[PDB]
Each structure stands twice: as C-alpha cells, then as structure tokens.
Design a protein around this motif. Structure first.
Motif, short mmCIF file in Angstrom:
data_model
loop_
_atom_site.label_atom_id
_atom_site.label_comp_id
_atom_site.label_asym_id
_atom_site.label_seq_id
_atom_site.Cartn_x
_atom_site.Cartn_y
_atom_site.Cartn_z
N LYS A 139 -30.67 -16.21 -27.98
CA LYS A 139 -31.53 -16.99 -27.07
C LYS A 139 -32.46 -17.84 -27.91
O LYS A 139 -32.52 -17.62 -29.13
CB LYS A 139 -32.33 -16.04 -26.19
CG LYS A 139 -31.54 -15.08 -25.34
CD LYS A 139 -30.68 -15.78 -24.32
CE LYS A 139 -31.45 -16.52 -23.24
NZ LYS A 139 -32.45 -15.69 -22.52
N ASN A 140 -33.23 -18.67 -27.21
CA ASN A 140 -34.19 -19.61 -27.82
C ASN A 140 -33.48 -20.47 -28.88
O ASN A 140 -34.07 -20.76 -29.93
CB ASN A 140 -35.38 -18.87 -28.42
CG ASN A 140 -36.55 -19.81 -28.61
OD1 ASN A 140 -36.77 -20.65 -27.78
ND2 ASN A 140 -37.22 -19.70 -29.73
N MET A 141 -32.27 -20.93 -28.61
CA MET A 141 -31.49 -21.62 -29.67
C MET A 141 -31.80 -23.11 -29.72
O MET A 141 -31.51 -23.73 -30.70
CB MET A 141 -29.99 -21.39 -29.46
CG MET A 141 -29.65 -19.96 -29.56
SD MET A 141 -27.85 -19.72 -29.37
CE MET A 141 -27.28 -20.57 -30.85
N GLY A 142 -32.45 -23.67 -28.68
CA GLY A 142 -32.54 -25.12 -28.52
C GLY A 142 -31.17 -25.77 -28.56
O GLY A 142 -30.16 -25.11 -28.19
N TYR A 143 -31.15 -27.01 -29.01
CA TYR A 143 -29.91 -27.80 -29.19
C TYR A 143 -29.26 -27.40 -30.50
O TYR A 143 -29.96 -27.29 -31.55
CB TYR A 143 -30.21 -29.30 -29.16
CG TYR A 143 -30.64 -29.81 -27.81
CD1 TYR A 143 -31.98 -29.78 -27.46
CD2 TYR A 143 -29.74 -30.33 -26.90
CE1 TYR A 143 -32.39 -30.25 -26.22
CE2 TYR A 143 -30.15 -30.84 -25.68
CZ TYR A 143 -31.47 -30.79 -25.33
OH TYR A 143 -31.88 -31.31 -24.13
N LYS A 196 -35.33 -18.07 -38.37
CA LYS A 196 -35.64 -19.49 -38.15
C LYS A 196 -34.37 -20.29 -38.43
O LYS A 196 -33.87 -20.25 -39.55
CB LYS A 196 -36.83 -19.93 -38.99
CG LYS A 196 -37.10 -21.43 -38.90
CD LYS A 196 -37.97 -21.89 -37.73
CE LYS A 196 -39.32 -22.39 -38.22
NZ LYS A 196 -39.17 -23.66 -38.98
N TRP A 197 -33.92 -21.02 -37.44
CA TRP A 197 -32.66 -21.80 -37.52
C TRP A 197 -32.81 -23.06 -36.66
O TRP A 197 -33.16 -22.89 -35.46
CB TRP A 197 -31.51 -20.91 -37.06
CG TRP A 197 -30.14 -21.53 -37.23
CD1 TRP A 197 -29.46 -21.78 -38.40
CD2 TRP A 197 -29.32 -22.02 -36.17
NE1 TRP A 197 -28.26 -22.40 -38.12
CE2 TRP A 197 -28.11 -22.50 -36.76
CE3 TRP A 197 -29.43 -22.02 -34.78
CZ2 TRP A 197 -27.09 -23.04 -35.98
CZ3 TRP A 197 -28.44 -22.56 -34.01
CH2 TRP A 197 -27.23 -22.98 -34.60
N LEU A 234 -23.40 -20.49 -39.40
CA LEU A 234 -24.48 -19.49 -39.52
C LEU A 234 -23.88 -18.09 -39.47
O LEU A 234 -24.21 -17.29 -40.32
CB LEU A 234 -25.52 -19.70 -38.42
CG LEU A 234 -26.60 -18.63 -38.35
CD1 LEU A 234 -27.55 -18.69 -39.54
CD2 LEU A 234 -27.28 -18.67 -37.02
N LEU A 235 -23.04 -17.83 -38.45
CA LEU A 235 -22.63 -16.43 -38.17
C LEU A 235 -21.62 -16.00 -39.25
O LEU A 235 -21.79 -14.90 -39.79
CB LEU A 235 -22.02 -16.28 -36.78
CG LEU A 235 -22.95 -16.53 -35.59
CD1 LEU A 235 -22.23 -16.39 -34.28
CD2 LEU A 235 -24.12 -15.58 -35.63
#
Ligand SMILES: [Cl-]
Ligand SMILES: [Cl-]
Ligand SMILES: [Cl-]
Ligand SMILES: [Cl-]
Ligand SMILES: [Cl-]
Ligand SMILES: [Cl-]
Ligand SMILES: [Cl-]
Ligand SMILES: [Cl-]
Ligand SMILES: [Cl-]
Ligand SMILES: [Cl-]
Ligand SMILES: [Cl-]
Ligand SMILES: [Cl-]
Ligand SMILES: [Cl-]
Ligand SMILES: [Cl-]
Ligand SMILES: [Cl-]
Ligand SMILES: [Cl-]
Ligand SMILES: [Cl-]
Ligand code: NA
Ligand code: NA
Ligand code: NA
Ligand code: NA
Ligand code: NA
Ligand code: NA
Ligand code: NA
Length: 75
Positions: free
Chosen positions: A8-12, A63-64, A21-22
């Motif tokens: 969640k809270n990923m933005g665009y 932070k991403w 990333l993963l």
C-alpha cells in the motif's frame, strides 16, 4: 499453498520498477503480481512463507519512488 501480501501507499509506479524491487533488489521469489491500476496498491504472492514474512518486515517502512511503503498479509 498461497503466501500473499498487499503493498500500500505505493503512489504512481511502473510494473517493471516494482518487479525490479521485489526480484532484483530484494531477491524475493515472486509467483504472481496483481497491480492493474499501476498506482497505490499491489498484491504479490511468494513461493515461500519465509519470503512473505520477509516482504512484510522489509516493505513496511521501505522508502521507494518517493513513498514510505506499507504492506499487510492478504487472504
Ligand atoms: Cl507518487
Ligand atoms: Cl498511494
Ligand atoms: Cl503508473
Ligand atoms: Cl517500469
Ligand atoms: Cl507500468
Ligand atoms: Cl526501474
Ligand atoms: Cl529497486
Ligand atoms: Cl529477501
Ligand atoms: Cl504475475
Ligand atoms: Cl482479482
Ligand atoms: Cl497487474
Ligand atoms: Cl491493465
Ligand atoms: Cl513455505
Ligand atoms: Cl525468505
Ligand atoms: Cl513496521
Ligand atoms: Cl527502510
Ligand atoms: Cl523523495
Ligand atoms: Na494506499
Ligand atoms: Na527502479
Ligand atoms: Na535477480
Ligand atoms: Na491489467
Ligand atoms: Na479500488
Ligand atoms: Na527505506
Ligand atoms: Na486484503
């Protein structure tokens, strides 16, 4: 068996960036990703419970792409 989270809270974001990333940066063994809107949320399933637990420990506070991510288990 299924080991799923929702990020969640990923933005665009771009799916390429997210899968980087993963799978490249955090070396998770990802079986599936559903992030069809390319914003705010992504569902992810891992081959092992260990990676699911790892994903929740790491991604909460990570932070991403300008955001401080959150994550929770998903059924
Ligand atoms: Cl954003
Ligand atoms: Cl967001
Ligand atoms: Cl996007
Ligand atoms: Cl991308
Ligand atoms: Cl994309
Ligand atoms: Cl990238
Ligand atoms: Cl990355
Ligand atoms: Cl890891
Ligand atoms: Cl997928
Ligand atoms: Cl669905
Ligand atoms: Cl998708
Ligand atoms: Cl689509
Ligand atoms: Cl397992
Ligand atoms: Cl692991
Ligand atoms: Cl936390
Ligand atoms: Cl962090
Ligand atoms: Cl920033
Ligand atoms: Na959100
Ligand atoms: Na990137
Ligand atoms: Na890799
Ligand atoms: Na889609
Ligand atoms: Na929605
Ligand atoms: Na961080
Ligand atoms: Na959920």
């Amino acid at each position: 068996e299924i080991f799923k989270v929702e990020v969640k809270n990923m933005g665009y974001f771009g799916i390429g960036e997210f899968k980087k990333l993963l799978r490249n940066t955090l070396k998770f063994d990802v079986t599936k990703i559903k992030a069809p809107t390319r914003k705010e949320f992504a569902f992810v399933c891992f081959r092992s419970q260990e990676d699911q637990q790892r994903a929740l420990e790491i991604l909460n506070g990570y932070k991403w792409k300008g955001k401080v991510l959150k994550a929770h288990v998903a059924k």
